[PDB]
Amino acid sequence: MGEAPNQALLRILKETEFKKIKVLGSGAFGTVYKGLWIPEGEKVKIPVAIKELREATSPKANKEILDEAYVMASVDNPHVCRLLGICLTSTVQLIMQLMPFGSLLDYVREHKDNIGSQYLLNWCVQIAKGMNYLEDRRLVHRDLAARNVLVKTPQHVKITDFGRAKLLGKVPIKWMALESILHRIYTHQSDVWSYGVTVWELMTFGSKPYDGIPASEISSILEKGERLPQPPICTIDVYMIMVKCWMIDADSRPKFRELIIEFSKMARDPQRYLVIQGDERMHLPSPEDMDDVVDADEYL
Ligand SMILES: CO[C@@H]1CCN(c2nccc(Nc3cc4n(C5CCC6(CC5)OCCO6)c(C)cn4n3)n2)C[C@@H]1F
Numbered sequence: 001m002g003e004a005p006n007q008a009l010l011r012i013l014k015e016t017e018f019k020k021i022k023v024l025g026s027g028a029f030g031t032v033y034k035g036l037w038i039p040e041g042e043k044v045k046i047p048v049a050i051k052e053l054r055e056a057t058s059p060k061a062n063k064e065i066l067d068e069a070y071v072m073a074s075v076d077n078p079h080v081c082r083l084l085g086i087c088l089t090s091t092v093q094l095i096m097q098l099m100p101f102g103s104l105l106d107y108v109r110e111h112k113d114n115i116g117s118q119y120l121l122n123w124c125v126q127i128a129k130g131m132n133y134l135e136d137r138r139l140v141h142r143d144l145a146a147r148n149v150l151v152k153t154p155q156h157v158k159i160t161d162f163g164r165a166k167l168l169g170k171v172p173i174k175w176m177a178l179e180s181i182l183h184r185i186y187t188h189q190s191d192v193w194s195y196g197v198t199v200w201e202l203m204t205f206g207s208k209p210y211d212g213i214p215a216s217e218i219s220s221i222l223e224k225g226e227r228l229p230q231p232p233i234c235t236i237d238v239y240m241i242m243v244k245c246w247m248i249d250a251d252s253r254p255k256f257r258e259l260i261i262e263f264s265k266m267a268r269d270p271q272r273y274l275v276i277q278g279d280e281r282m283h284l285p286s287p288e289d290m291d292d293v294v295d296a297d298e299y300l
């Protein structure tokens with residue numbers, strides 16, 4: 001025992017236990033469907049996202065989806081997405097929890113006129129909680145960004161996208177720490193950098209970081225000492241935390257546990273820390289042969 005044994009269970013599901021209802025999106029990875037999973041013998045209906053392979057089943061693609069599935073089967077935290085199982089059909093399918101409100105990036109862009117300070121600062125806490133869990137599990141995420149946080153409810157977000165994640169190419173330069181761009185060094189403290197950019201995406205309502213700058217210049221821009229600008233809604237309190245995440249010395253950046261502490265202090269008095277016009281009034285969502293629908297988080 002030099003590392004501890006990963007005693008996670010990989011569950012293999014029959015195709016007959018589930019049904020695809022609509023497509024939620026498609027890329028070069030394949031297709032995410034909305035479905036229901038109904039495990040045999042249990043009077044339980046579980047809403048799922050089924051990520052099917054690209055149909056072009058291929059040793060390289062099949063390798064990489066199973067690496068993602070390895071990590072997603074191995075995590076268990078309220079702010080991290082878990083895999084429910086695999087189906088080993090001709091195109092392999094990962095069965096995941098449905099996060100019905102989508103990515104947090106798209107959510108902030110769509111709902112900006114009704115997102116208030118309490119929600120933004122609570123999202124920051126939740127992402128810091130889930131990243132602190134990944135640090136405990138010894139996983140460096142390597143692709144933290146507001147695209148890769150999903151919304152179960154507006155009150156409940158989870159980190160996803162474990163397809164870069166590593167223990168202990170085309171790359172997302174504008175979320176990466178300087179050591180990662182220059183030297184390929186990745187650490188928990190380089191995910192802290194990306195957390196800073198992620199918070200910046202949220203507090204700017206989904207604005208693109210470094211918009212217009214070619215990715216070759218980013219490393220030189222950063223070496224010269226420039227960072228992303230203070231979002232309009234942000235007090236110096238919140239923005240100084242973003243700045244601290246973007247220090248050159250990685251050990252001078254905050255820990256995820258300290259981000260939990262700081263953002264949760266701020267979340268007890270939101271309007272002292274983010275200034276949003278109309279904040280006091282803003283009210284967001286809180287939610288069909290569907291008697292036996294249980295969410296995956298209650299199906300242990
Ligand atoms: C491209 O591989 C990723 C792997 C991670 N993923 C995921 N993990 C754990 C649960 C879950 N659940 C879910 C996803 C969605 N979506 C979208 C979100 C945005 C989207 C299309 C699917 O995924 C990213 C690109 O575009 C919607 C409208 C409802 N739910 N519920 N998804 C989403 C992808 F599969």
Ligand SMILES: [Cl-]
Nearest residue numbers: 006074137167
């Ligand atoms: Cl692990």
Ligand SMILES: [Cl-]
Nearest residue numbers: 204207231232
């Ligand atoms: Cl801006």
Ligand SMILES: [Cl-]
Nearest residue numbers: 232233234235
């Ligand atoms: Cl200001």
Ligand SMILES: [Cl-]
Nearest residue numbers: 244254258262
């Ligand atoms: Cl601090």
